Amino acid sequence: LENAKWGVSQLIQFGNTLLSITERQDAEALAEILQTQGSELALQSIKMQ
Amino acid sequence: REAAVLQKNYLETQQAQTQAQLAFLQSKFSNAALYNWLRGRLSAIYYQFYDLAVSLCLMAEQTYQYELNNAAAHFIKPGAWHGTYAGLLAGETLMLN
Amino acid sequence: REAAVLQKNYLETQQAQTQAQLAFLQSKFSNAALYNWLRGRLSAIYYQF
Amino acid sequence: LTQLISFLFQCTQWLTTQKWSVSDVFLMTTDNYSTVLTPDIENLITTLSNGLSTLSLGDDELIRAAAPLIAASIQMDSAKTAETILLWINQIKPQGL
Amino acid sequence: LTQLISFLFQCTQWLTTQKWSVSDVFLMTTDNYSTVLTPDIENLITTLSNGLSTLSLGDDELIRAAAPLIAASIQMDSAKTAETILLWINQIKPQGLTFDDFMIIAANRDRSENETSNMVAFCQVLGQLSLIVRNIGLSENELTLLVTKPEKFQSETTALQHDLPTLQALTRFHAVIMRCGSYATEILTALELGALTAEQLAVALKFDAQVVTQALQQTDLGVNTFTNWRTIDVTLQWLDVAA
Amino acid sequence: SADNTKLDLTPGESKNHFYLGIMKRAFRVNDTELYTLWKLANGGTNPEF
Numbered sequence: 294l295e296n297a298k299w300g301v302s303q304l305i306q307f308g309n310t311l312l313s314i315t316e317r318q319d320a321e322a323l324a325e326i327l328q329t330q331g332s333e334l335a336l337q338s339i340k341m342q
Numbered sequence: 343r344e345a346a347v348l349q350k351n352y353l354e355t356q357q358a359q360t361q362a363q364l365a366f367l368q369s370k371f372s373n374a375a376l377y378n379w380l381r382g383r384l385s386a387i388y389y390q391f392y393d394l395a396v397s398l399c400l401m402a403e404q405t406y407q408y409e410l411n412n413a414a415a416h417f418i419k420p421g422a423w424h425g426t427y428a429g430l431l432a433g434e435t436l437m438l439n
Numbered sequence: 440r441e442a443a444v445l446q447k448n449y450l451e452t453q454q455a456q457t458q459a460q461l462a463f464l465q466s467k468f469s470n471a472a473l474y475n476w477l478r479g480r481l482s483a484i485y486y487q488f
Numbered sequence: 489l490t491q492l493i494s495f496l497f498q499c500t501q502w503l504t505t506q507k508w509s510v511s512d513v514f515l516m517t518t519d520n521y522s523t524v525l526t527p528d529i530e531n532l533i534t535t536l537s538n539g540l541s542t543l544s545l546g547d548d549e550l551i552r553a554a555a556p557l558i559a560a561s562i563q564m565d566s567a568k569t570a571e572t573i574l575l576w577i578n579q580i581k582p583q584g585l
Numbered sequence: 586l587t588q589l590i591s592f593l594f595q596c597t598q599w600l601t602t603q604k605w606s607v608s609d610v611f612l613m614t615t616d617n618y619s620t621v622l623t624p625d626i627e628n629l630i631t632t633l634s635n636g637l638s639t640l641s642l643g644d645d646e647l648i649r650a651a652a653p654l655i656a657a658s659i660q661m662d663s664a665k666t667a668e669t670i671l672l673w674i675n676q677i678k679p680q681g682l683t684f685d686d687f688m689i690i691a692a693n694r695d696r697s698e699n700e701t702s703n704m705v706a707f708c709q710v711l712g713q714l715s716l717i718v719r720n721i722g723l724s725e726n727e728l729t730l731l732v733t734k735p736e737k738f739q740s741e742t743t744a745l746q747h748d749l750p751t752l753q754a755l756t757r758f759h760a761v762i763m764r765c766g767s768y769a770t771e772i773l774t775a776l777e778l779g780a781l782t783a784e785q786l787a788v789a790l791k792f793d794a795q796v797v798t799q800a801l802q803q804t805d806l807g808v809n810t811f812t813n814w815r816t817i818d819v820t821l822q823w824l825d826v827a828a
Numbered sequence: 829s830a831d832n833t834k835l836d837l838t839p840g841e842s843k844n845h846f847y848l849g850i851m852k853r854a855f856r857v858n859d860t861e862l863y864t865l866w867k868l869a870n871g872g873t874n875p876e877f
Contacts, residue, residue, distance in 0.1 A: 294402050296398055296401075296402075297395070297398045297399050297401070297402040298437075300391075300394060300395040300398045300399075301395050301398075301399070301433050301436045301437050302433070302437075303391065303395075303433075304388075304391055304392065304395045304432060304433035304436065305433035305437065306433075307384070307387070307388050307391055307433075308388065308429075308430050308431065308433050308434075310384065311381065311384050311385065311388055311428070311430070312430060312469075314380045314381045314384055315377075315381050315428075315468055315469050316469040317377050318374060318377035318378060318381055318662075319467045319468065321372075321373065321374040321377055322463075322467075323460070323463060323467075324367065325364075325367050325368075325373075325374055326459070326460070326463065327460075328360065328364040329364065330456040330459070331360050332357070332360045332361060332364055333452070334449070334452060334453070335353070335356055335360050336357060337445075337448070337449050337452060338353055338356075339350065339353045339357060340445065341442060341445045341446065341449065342349060342350040342353050374660065375660050378656070378657060378661070378662070379632070379658065380657070381656075381657065382653045382655070382656040382657020382664070382667075383632070383636060383653070383654065383657045385653040385657075385664055386636060386650070386653035386654055389653070390638070419541075421534070421537075421538030421539070422538065424531075424535070424538075426527075426531055427473060427476060427477075430473075430477065431477065431480055431481060431484070434480075434481065435484065435539075437488075438484050438487060438488060466722070466724055467662075468663065472563055475559070475560060475563045475564075476535075476560040476561065477560075478560070479556045479557060479558075479560025479567070480535075480539060480556070480557070480560050482556045482567060483539065483556040483557060483560075486556075487541075511791060515767065520784070522771055522775070522785060523780075524771060524774055524775045524778065524780055525774065526770060526771055527726065527770060527774060528770065793860055793861070793864070795839065795860040795863065796858075796860050799839070
């Protein structure tokens, strides 16, 4: 039971870390796509000026 | 007219700064590529660790069923790796069991 | 008039980019549905614990 | 006839006050729905099968057990809302269930 | 001649609708790619060599083992998307390489120039597939359907190709499914089976049941349900003309 | 002319195109929409027009 509780506590740690990694990944991809479309809008605004 | 030319130069400066921010987001070490590699590698290690920990829980269940003379004591529920949510909270379900 | 047409094209680009952000928030893995499922499952496990 | 006209008028007024469409109210109030096995329904099936423990006692205890899992599956925020929706559907019984 | 003119016109229209360039479609669909050993390909090699355990069994188990590592290496978000892309490339085999015998050309560090050229072509086809998925937008419930059962894409295809018409039809398929909105998963899982009929597509696209079933009877005189995507597309073309 | 002439409003079995086109233009409606308009008038049925 001590060995099993060890392994399951390590698995809890890995699941928490995987959750944090995938939400950081999603926020990073969001910021990247925001910068790309901001660049395109800046080009269009220069063409308007 | 000269004021409008200065305004166009301001807009060109804004475009150059947005390009600099995009280049920084590409060239930073903690970009999206590092997190993609982290989540893929960690999903692989997490699944293999799920196999190992459910094997250890089955070891403990076999031990309990041998000690208390009862072969029907089934405490580890089948499941707990829900693949559509990538098997999260598997450690929570196994800790509960 | 041509400047106003370019402005309307800029506004259409802004609408398309906001739709792209909404589609990204729907299609990301760490959306609201994953957190809803996490809080329900964890509330059940928390009560039994 | 004038009852039908007044009903259609006040229903259209309430609809455009609530900023819904006829398709939206038809989704929330229809009875000609599909019979196909949706992946959301499959996830509800496997969640409500695996996460649930031994078979419990009716609306008194089985509903309070299964309300967090149902609020997990269909995207509701409160287990109390899921519980009273389960009472709502138990006093309604769609297709005898 | 007029077929070529119409093809170039509708390809340019789909291109400017999708806001891509000819260079972008050439990147996603070319066949004259490089043979040089990219650092991304080197990272894929060392990841898929070191992180992988003992040598597993084919598309059944080795693909499910190596899909998180491939989704880690080339920047995809889901191991299920990486798995169905691996099935896509295993039924395509660029330069003879399946997913097996790419692992064996990898993990050696002593290979021929043809061997590293074949592994580089394999990794570049993988990158092209990553772009062709994340550019058009596919959360794999539409994609793995067309990968596993390409009959549901078209009844004549039987092998989902890397071609420009397959890309354009993928675009229009994804556009119709995203236009379905709230019923999109129901339309997809009804096309998974053969139960997708009228009064479901007409509900999902806010049409009339009799108009939809008249167009379906016009494109197929006795097929009551939607058994394919090509009948759905020509049905919506009939509806567009009638509207 | 409002004659008592029978006409089945199912969208394929009319063959009396004069009254059909006159009704469709006067009600600004399609064949199918006219048929479901007549079906709403008799509670989902089409007895006889």
